[PDB]
Design a protein around this ligand. Structure first.
Ligand SMILES: COCc1cc2cc(c1)C(=O)N[C@H]([C@H](O)CNC1(c3cccc(C(C)C)c3)CC1)Cc1cccc(c1)OCCCCN2
Length: 377
């Protein structure tokens, strides 16, 4: 019955993917950001300049106050609110209703986005990183406890404004081609994985693989960019600069500030390298790779100038908190969060990114010795 969940995601480019949900009795409809990089379910519950609607607890007969406060600081944004529970449904999801923890957001700073069309956030990661602490059961845990929905979901994020599918409780085979390749979830807090090798246009970065996972590597639909640890970021930029040296860019471009433009249709895709991330596989000394095209890490931005050219932002960012495989990485892949078997699967998406002479890929098996040494402790 997964067909009902196909294409249940929408969004604006760079503003996040959201799914429709209802909370409370009678049902109040809200668009909820899909975020595998956090674990709190929270909704606007008070007026805000950027909210068109919000959760009204007084109007719901099934609402319960937990009489406790909560706040959540993300990378830049944060909100605080009051904890409670209420009945929750996903119209284009499984036909069930669950009583879930809900943070009613009463104050926020740089959290809600003007024009994003979502009013809440669904943290899909594990209780370990839930606020105020891991005793606050995350939504998906509640879903799995209270219903017969299997303990897994899959995300097909399609580029561009944007659309996609969140298949709750299973895998929909019409959404990907080729084989699914699985990498272990290293620890159940973030969806943490281990990167064991990195190549750019087929050339190994040849760093200590611990550098790739310092201090962690995670899959995060709630973050746009590929974010890389400082040392890896520098090596990667150096290699990508070298490959594209035929053209010149502002150095603020490599920092993600200045967008670069070309005459509509003349974007020199060919001079930007493919990036291959090798992930630890399911059997001994085995890994597989996903290959990212420049169309994924050069994100299209509307030109502020009167010219309708093709302008792009460099969507690879330096991190101090580990590798983040963000939405631009997940796009064009079908990603299976198989919580039941503690693994994440990757396959080429049906809505894969197009290049003239190149193709995003998930390929294996590869042999990689000493993969356990790649994990940072
Ligand atoms: C370049 O970095 C800036 C940046 C860009 C983006 C998102 C975040 C940060 C963002 O903060 N993302 C968090 C996710 O939950 C973040 N997930 C992580 C995180 C980081 C700090 C603290 C927590 C805890 C709440 C567990 C989790 C693991 C990285 C979710 C989020 C919160 C608020 C607005 C959002 C998304 O907008 C969606 C569209 C913008 C996507 N780009």
């Amino acid at each position: 019955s997964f067909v009902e969940m196909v294409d249940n995601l929408r969004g604006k480019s760079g503003q996040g993917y959201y799914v429709e949900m209802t909370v409370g009795s009678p049902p109040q409809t809200l668009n909820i950001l899909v975020d595998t990089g956090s674990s709190n379910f929270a909704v606007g519950a008070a007026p805000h300049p950027f909210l068109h609607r919000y959760y009204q607890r007084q109007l719901s007969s099934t609402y319960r106050d937990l009489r406790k406060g909560v706040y959540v600081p993300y990378t830049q944004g944060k909100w605080e609110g009051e904890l409670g529970t209420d009945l929750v449904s996903i119209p284009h999801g499984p036909n069930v209703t669950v009583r879930a923890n809900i943070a009613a957001i009463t104050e926020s700073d740089k959290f809600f986005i003007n024009g994003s069309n979502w009013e809440g956030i669904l943290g899909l990661a594990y209780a370990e990183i839930a606020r105020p602490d891991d005793s606050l059961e995350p939504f998906f845990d509640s879903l799995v406890k209270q219903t017969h929905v299997p303990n897994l979901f899959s995300l097909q994020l399609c580029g561009a404004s944007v659309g996609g599918s969140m298949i709750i409780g299973g895998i929909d085979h019409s959404l990907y081609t080729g084989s699914l390749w699985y990498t272990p979830i290293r620890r159940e807090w973030y969806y943490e994985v281990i990167i064991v090798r990195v190549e750019i246009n087929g050339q190994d970065l040849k760093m200590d693989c611990k550098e790739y996972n310092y201090d962690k590597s995670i899959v995060d639909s709630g973050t746009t960019n590929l974010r890389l640890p400082k040392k890896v970021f520098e090596a990667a930029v150096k290699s990508i600069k070298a490959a594209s040296s035929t053209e010149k860019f502002p150095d603020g471009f490599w920092l993600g500030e200045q967008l670069v433009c070309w005459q509509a249709g003349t974007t020199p895709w060919n001079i930007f390298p493919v990036i291959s991330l090798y992930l630890m596989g399911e059997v001994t000394n085995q890994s597989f790779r996903i290959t990212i095209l420049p169309q994924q890490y050069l994100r299209p931005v509307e030109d502020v100038a009167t010219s309708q050219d093709d302008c792009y932002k460099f969507a690879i960012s330096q991190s101090s908190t580990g590798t983040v495989m963000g939405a631009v990485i997940m796009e064009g892949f079908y990603v299976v969060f198989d919580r039941a078997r503690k693994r994440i699967g990757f396959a080429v998406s049906a809505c894969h990114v197009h290049d003239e002479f190149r193709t995003a890929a998930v390929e294996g098996p590869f042999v990689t010795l000493d993969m356990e040494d790649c994990g940072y402790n």
